[PDB]
């Protein structure tokens, strides 16, 4: 595992958390517009 | 799902539901009267 | 954001709009009635 | 990126990448359902 292919693991890791965040943080804000439809 | 809409359509329609239902015998109360 | 909720809220808070537009102006005109 | 706590790195690089991808699925069908809406 570690050596190399975790490297582009934790690379890929931080990538998809962040777009994870990105995405979350995205539609809640999308739902926290109005929250009284 | 996406919890906060799902949810929140839900309560917006039971809403309306009620003012539909209230503003359609309503309505028909205001040919009554 | 999310287009699909947004805009079509958008068509929905309009009808809902009419809806206790007219239940408001309605029950008020009953009342007085 | 080691022999320490990679596990839960491993763990939760394939489970938010299937989240990811669940959650654009879901969004496309959880509006999508709502036709009526």
Known sequence: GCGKSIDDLEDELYAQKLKYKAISEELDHALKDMTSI | ?33
Chains 1, 4 share one sequence.
């Open chain 2, 1 to 33: 799902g996406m919890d906060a809409i799902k949810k929140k359509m839900q309560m917006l329609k039971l809403d309306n539901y009620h003012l539909e239902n209230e503003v359609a015998r309503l309505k028909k109360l205001v040919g009554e009267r």
